[PDB]
Design a protein around this nucleic acid. Structure first.
Ligand SMILES: [Mg+2]
Ligand code: NA
Ligand code: NA
Length: 328
DNA sequence: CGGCATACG
DNA sequence: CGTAT
DNA sequence: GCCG
């Protein structure tokens, strides 16, 4: 009744088990902070199963036969159903380790490994990091400077304004080039913490060298507060107008040749768990190797040509899911 | 028990 | 090491 | 942590 892979089932953005899924996702996050990628995956998958259910779980027996619910995830749900709270989840929430690792890893430029090292050095607050700035990368300095703005959600109205300024720069850099909104906003989210755009051109090869030309033009317009600088992905901080002022916003720009555009669109539309599950399914169930550039048959040694996302789902034997149902 | 997605900067 | 879905 |  419930398939084992997230790419085999629709997952809407809003659902009927929000509290249960949130709790499991705390444990997934905490597992990641400790480097337990396997446990993170299981808790992520179990949470996603609940998002895909058609009604609320009210009794423990409703978990029977659901994939990725074993002793541990079932106990979490059982405690939430019985008491409205799971002691393990609450212990994680208030732990100094969890709170500090969450604070540090949310900094642009800081991953689990860096945050863990700082935690082991005794560091706990953003101001702790500010007081020792020689130990920071330029990327981390920017993440810390802009951390407050970057913690504030971006609205869809903001996204539309950003897309227009990106299109202007892209049109000068390469007439005919197109800009597509991807990521969480393409899946229907009304807010987000970053904006994702995918850029291509209908004439194969014309997109070569495009991203530097786009970045130089955005920078000349005074819109780039931070970027790394040939390349095809740019992780930027943009200056976004606001009433009488402005705010910093994370924007990612990606270029792909049109032959690869369906694969890049699929990959950059997510969710992250949906894409991991889709690539796992492709390799393990179909023997095909999927990434954001293409889909490879290692037996024939050939790449599948796709003209659409629909093509890719068909080539994997999966029912098509629109972006709004990929919220795994 | 092995496996857990797969890239680019 | 960081970044992304 | 869970699946096959
Ligand atoms: Mg995003
Ligand atoms: Na980070
Ligand atoms: Na992004």
């Amino acid at each position: 009744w419930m398939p084992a892979y997230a790419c085999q089932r629709p997952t809407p953005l809003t659902h009927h088990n929000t509290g249960l899924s949130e709790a499991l996702e705390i444990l997934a996050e905490a597992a990641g902070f400790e480097g337990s990628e396997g446990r993170l995956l299981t808790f992520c998958r179990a949470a996603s199963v609940l998002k895909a259910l058609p009604s609320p779980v009210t009794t423990l027996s409703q978990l029977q036969g659901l994939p990725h619910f074993g002793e541990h995830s079932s106990r979490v749900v059982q405690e939430l159903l019985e008491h409205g709270v799971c002691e393990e989840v609450e212990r994680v929430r208030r732990s100094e380790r969890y709170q500090t690792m969450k604070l540090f890893t949310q900094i642009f430029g800081v991953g689990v490994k860096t945050a863990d090292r700082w935690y082991r050095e005794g560091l706990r607050t953003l101001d702790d990091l500010r007081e020792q700035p020689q130990k920071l990368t330029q990327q981390q300095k920017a993440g810390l400077q802009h951390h407050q703005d970057l913690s504030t959600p971006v609205l869809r109205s903001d996204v539309d304004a950003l897309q227009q300024v990106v299109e202007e720069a892209v049109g000068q850099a390469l007439p005919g080039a197109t800009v597509t909104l991807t990521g969480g906003f393409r899946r229907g989210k009304l807010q987000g913490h970053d904006v994702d755009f995918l850029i291509t051109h209908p004439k194969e090869g014309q997109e070569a060298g495009l991203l530097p030309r786009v970045m130089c033009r955005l920078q000349d317009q005074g819109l780039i507060l931070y970027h790394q600088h040939a390349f095809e992905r740019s992780f930027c901080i943009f200056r976004l107008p606001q009433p009488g002022s402005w705010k910093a916003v994370r924007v990612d720009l990606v270029v792909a040749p049109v032959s690869q555009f369906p694969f890049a669109l699929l990959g950059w539309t997510g969710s992250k768990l949906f894409q991991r599950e889709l690539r796992r399914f492709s390799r393990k169930e179909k023997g095909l190797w999927l990434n954001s550039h293409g889909l490879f048959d290692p037996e024939q040694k050939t790449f599948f040509q796709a003209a659409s996302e629909e093509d890719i789902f068909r080539h994997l034997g999966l029912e098509y899911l629109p972006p709004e149902q990929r919220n795994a």
